[PDB]
Amino acid sequence: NDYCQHFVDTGHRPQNFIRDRELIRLKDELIAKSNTPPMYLQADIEAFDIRELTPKFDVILLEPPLEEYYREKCWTWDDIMKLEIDEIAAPRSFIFLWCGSGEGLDLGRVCLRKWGYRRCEDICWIKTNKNNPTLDPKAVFQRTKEHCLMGIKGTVVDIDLIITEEPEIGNIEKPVEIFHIIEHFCLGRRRLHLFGRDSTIRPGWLTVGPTLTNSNYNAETYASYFSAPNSYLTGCTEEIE
Amino acid sequence: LFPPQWICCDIRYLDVSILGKFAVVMADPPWDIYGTLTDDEMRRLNIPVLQDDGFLFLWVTGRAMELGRECLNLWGYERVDEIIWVKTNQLQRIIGHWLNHGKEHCLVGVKGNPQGFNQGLDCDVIVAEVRSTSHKPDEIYGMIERLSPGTRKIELFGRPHNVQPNWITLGNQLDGIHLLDPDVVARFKQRYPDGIISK
Ligand SMILES: CNc1cc(N2CCC[C@@](O)(CNC(=O)c3ccc(CN4CCC(C)(C)CC4)cc3)C2)ncn1
C-alpha cells in the first residue's frame, strides 16, 4: 500500500520495495567485439581547448563534478554552460548529461539547448537505502535520485530507470549501468566521457578528465579506428573483414 | 470548508479569482503532446492569482517536461523539486522512442516564501500501482497533506475520483458544482448569479 507513509514511519525509501528474453547478450558480445581500445587523456578541461579532441563524437557522456555531490575542484553550472560542447559533437550525435537533483534539472536543459540538442529521454538513477534506513534549503522533499538527461542533435530494450543502493558518503561514482544503456542504443563508435576518472575507463570509450593519472590519447591513432571501411558502424555489428 | 468541493467548468474560462488563495496547487494538464489545451492556453491560465506563498505540483510528460517548466516560471514559480512516480503492478514490479518509460514526473514549484510547511518529511520517489489510464497515485495527496496539514488546496484538471477533503477540484468531467466554504459560495453567487460560466 502506501510506501510514502512507510518512509515517514520507518525511513525506508519507497524504492527499497521495488522487486526484480535471454537474447540481449549476443548484442553485448557484438558491442564488445566492435569496441575500440580504451583511450584516455588527462586534461584540465577548464584550461583545455576542447577542439583538440577529434574527430567529432557520436556520443558524449558529460559528468561534471557538481558541488551537491560533495555534501558531507567542483564545477558550477556557470562553468558547465560555458563549455563549447557543440564544437566536438558530430552533426548527428547524442549527449548524456548527469544533472544531479537540484538546479541542474533546469540548467542542464539550458545547456542541452545551448549546445544544439533536444532532450529525448530523462533517465533517473533511483537510490535505495536498504542498508541504512541533510536538505538543500530550497528542497521540499528528501532527494533520493539523480537525473541523466539524454539529448539528440540532427535527424534520429532498456527502461529510463537505474536502481542501486546509495553509495557511501564521499563516493561520487555514477552507476556503470548508464554505460550499458548508452551502448545498447548502438549510436556509433566515437564515444567521449568528459570528467571520467581512472576508475571509469572502459573499452570503446575515450575518457578525458583532470584526475586521470595516465594518458594514451593520440588524435591520429584515435582517428585511425574510424577510418574507412569502418566510418559508420553502429558499434553493434560485426567487424568488416 | 473541510469536506470535498468541486466545480465542473472549463478551466480556460472560470474566473478563478473567486476561489481565494491556496497553500498548494496541483495540476495535471492535458498537454498538447480527451481534449487538450494549446501551449498558449496553458501559458495564459490565471495560475498567478491562486497563491501568495506556497507550492505548485505540476505533472509533465514528453515535451511538457520543458513546456511545463516554461509555464511554471511564467506563472511566477521557481522549480525546487521533481517527484517521480515509479509505476508498479500489484507485485511491486516496474511496468519517448529510445527507452521504455517506467515513471511519471511531477514538477514542484515554489512561490513567495512559504512558512510553516513540513519540508523534508517525504522523499521525492513514489512507488505505487498503476490504477487506470491517466489516474495519478493517491499517495501524492498524503505527501501534500503531511507537507501542509489542514490548509486550503486546489486541483486543476481533476476528475471525480480526485475530490478530497481540504481540496477544491476543477475539471470539465465533474458532476455539477459542490461548494461548501461560505466565502467561496458568496463570491461564486456574486460573480455567477445564474450559475453559468461562459467567456
Ligand atoms: C478544455 N478545457 C478544460 C479541460 C479539462 N480537461 C480536459 C478533459 C479531461 C479532464 O476532464 C480530466 N483530465 C484527464 O482526464 C487527464 C488525462 C490525462 C492526463 C495526463 N496525465 C495523466 C495522469 C498522470 C499522473 C499519469 C500523468 C499524465 C491528465 C488528466 C480535464 N478540464 C477543464 N477545462
Method: X-ray
Exposed/middle/buried for residue A232 (C-beta within 10 Å: 0-12, 13-18, 19+): exposed
Would residue A61 count as lying in a domain? yes
Residue A42 DSSP symbol: E
Question: Cell numbers at residue B27, please?
Answer: 495540476
> How far is it, in rounded angstroms, from Cα A13 to Cα B86?
12
Q: Whose CA is nearest to atom 18 of ligand 1?
A: B134
Which residues, in sequence order, are CB contacts of B195 under 8 Å at separation 6+? Answer: B177
The residue count of chain A comes to: 241
Is A215 part of a structural domain of the chain? Answer: yes
Q: Give domain status of residue A4, yes or no.
A: no
Alpha-carbon gap, residue A101 to A88, rounded angstroms = 27
Range of the domain at A116: 34-124+147-158+170-224
Boundaries of domain holding B40: 1-199
- Cα B52 to the chain's mean position, in Å? 16
Where residue A195 falls (left for φ over 0; alpha for ψ -120 to 50; beta otherwise) is left
Instruction: Identify the H or E element spanning A106.
Output: helix A104-114
Q: Which of A18, A105, A122 sits opposite B88 (nearest CB)?
A: A18
Resolution in A: 1.9
**CB-based contact (8 Å) between A109 and chain B?**
yes
Query: Whose C-alpha lies nearest to ligand 1, atom 17?
Result: B134
- Ligand 1 atom closest to the CA of B37, numbered from 1: 1
Q: What is the distance in angstroms between the CA of the first residue and the CA of the last residue of chain B?
A: 27
Nearest to B18 by CA among B144, B142, B195, B192: B192
Rounded to an integer, what distance in angstroms lies between the CA atom of residue A180 and that of residue A41?
22
Cα A241 to ligand 1 centroid, rounded to whole Å:
56
**A213's grid cell:** 593519472
Instruction: Give the residue from A217, A196, A236 showing the smallest Cα distance to A54.
Output: A217
CB-CB contact of B87 with B128 (8 Å): yes
Pick from B5, B122, B192: which is nearest to A144 by CA? B122
Domain count across chain A: 1
Half-sphere exposure for B75 (CA within 13 Å, toward CB) = 34
List the single best residue of B99, B130, B143 to mutate versus A (max A Cβ within 10 A): B99
Beta strands in chain B (DSSP E): 5-8, 24-27, 54-60, 78-88, 103-111, 125-129, 153-156, 167-171, 177-178
Q: How far apart are CA B28 and CA B136, in angstroms?
A: 9
Do B119 and B54 touch, CB atoms closer than 8 A?
no
Contact between B81 and A160 using a beta-carbon 8 Å cutoff: no
Residue A150: strand pairing partners: A96, A121
**Domain-located, residue A129:** no
Q: Do B12 and B45 contact (CB within 8 A), yes or no?
A: yes
**Residue B14, amino acid:** L
Chain-centroid distance of CA A98 in Å reads 6
Nearest to B94 among A101, A141, A159 (CB): A159
Domain total for chain B? 1
Q: Is B92 in the pocket of ligand 1 (CB under 6 A)?
A: no
**C-alpha to C-alpha distances, A11 to A151, A163, A191, B148, B152, nearest whole angstrom:** 35, 18, 40, 20, 28
Alpha carbon of B102: minimum distance to chain A alpha carbons (Å): 6
Beta strands B78-88 and B103-111, pairing class: antiparallel
Cα–Cα distance measured from residue B2 to residue B14, given in angstroms and rounded to the nearest whole number:
22
Nearest to B165 by CA among B147, B185, B151, B176: B151
CA-B12 nearest atom, ligand 1: 2
Query: How far is ligand 1, taken at its centre, from the CA of residue A132, in Å?
Result: 39
Confirm whether A75 is domain-assigned.
yes
The half-sphere exposure of B170 on its side-chain side, counting CA atoms within 13 A, is 22
Which residue among B82, B88, B122 places its CB closest to the CB of A105?
Answer: B82
Find the DSSP H helices in A185-233. 219-224
Q: Is A114 on the interface with B (CB under 8 A)?
A: no
Question: B54-60 and B103-111 as β-strands: parallel, antiparallel, unpaired?
Answer: antiparallel
A58 CA → ligand 1 middle, Å? 39
- Contact (CB, 8 A) for A198 and A153: no
Mutate to test the pocket of ligand 1, among B15, B33, B34 (most ligand atoms within 8 A of CB): B34
Q: Is B115 on the interface with A (CB under 8 A)?
A: no
List, in sequence order, every beta strand (DSSP E) within chain A.
Answer: 39-42, 57-62, 89-100, 118-128, 145-153, 161-165, 191-194, 206-209
> Is there a domain that residue A179 lies in?
yes
C-alpha B191 to ligand 1 mean position (Å)? 26
Provide the CATH number for the domain around residue A154: 3.40.50.150
